[PDB]
Each structure stands twice: as C-alpha cells, then as structure tokens.
Design a protein around this ligand. Structure first.
Ligand SMILES: [Zn+2]
Length: 41
C-alpha cells in the first residue's frame, strides 16, 4: 500500500521527458543528450 503523491518540477526535458530541480542540472542533461548517450546508452 502506497501513501505518497508525486509533485512536479520547475524544469523538464523536452527530448525524453525528464525533470530536474536546478536550471544547471537540466542543462547538463540537455547537452549530454548528443553523442552516445540519448538516454541510457
Ligand atoms: Zn532528456
């Protein structure tokens, strides 16, 4: 039995659907998207 709701974040990736709580954190995930790491690689 679960007892906890899920909240939204101020940031959200528009490439996969991720979400971060830091403008800088998101960027790091929006830049690494290119190359050999589209998500999990
Ligand atoms: Zn992403």
């Amino acid at each position: 039995g679960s007892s906890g709701s899920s909240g939204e974040k101020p940031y959200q990736c528009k490439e996969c659907g991720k979400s971060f709580s830091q403008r800088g954190s998101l960027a790091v995930h929006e830049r690494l998207h290119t190359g050999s790491g589209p998500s999990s690689g």
